[PDB]
Design brief:
This is part of a larger assembly, with 2 copies of chain A.
Chain A (H helix, E strand, L loop, with lengths): L2 H16 L4 H7 L1 H8 L11
Subcellular location (chain B): Virion
Protein name (chain B): Inner capsid protein VP3
Family (chain B): Belongs to the turreted BTV-fold inner capsid family.
C-alpha cells in the first residue's frame, strides 16, 4: 500500500474515532429506562435468558 | 469623575510629528500572540494525525 493512501486511511479512521456521537451515552443511561417502561406495555411480556 | 472618560485599551496623548505603523501597541501585541498560539495549535499532535 502506497504510504500516501496509507496516510489517508489512518486519517479517515482517526476522524471516525473523534466524532462526538451521542449513542454510547444513550445506551448506557437512557435506553434501559425506555425498555423498563415499555416492558409493561407490549401485549407480550419480555422473555429473557 | 466629571470631565473624565474610561477607555478599554491603553491610551496616549496625540503624537507630535507624522504618524507611522508601529508594533508595540497593546492591540498589535494581542494580535501577534494570538496568531503565535494558533500556529502552535495547528502543529499540535491532534492536527498531525488527520
Amino acid at each position: 500500500v502506497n504510504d500516501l493512501t496509507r496516510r489517508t486511511m489512518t486519517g479517515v479512521m482517526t476522524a471516525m474515532r473523534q466524532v462526538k456521537t451521542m449513542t454510547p451515552f444513550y445506551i448506557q443511561h437512557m435506553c434501559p429506562t425506555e425498555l423498563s417502561v415499555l416492558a409493561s406495555v407490549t401485549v407480550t411480556p419480555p422473555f429473557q435468558v | 469623575p466629571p470631565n473624565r472618560m474610561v477607555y478599554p485599551w491603553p491610551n496616549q496623548p496625540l503624537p507630535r510629528l507624522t504618524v507611522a505603523p508601529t508594533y508595540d501597541s497593546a492591540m498589535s501585541n494581542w494580535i501577534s500572540t494570538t496568531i503565535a498560539f494558533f500556529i502552535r495549535v495547528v502543529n499540535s499532535v491532534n492536527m498531525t494525525a488527520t
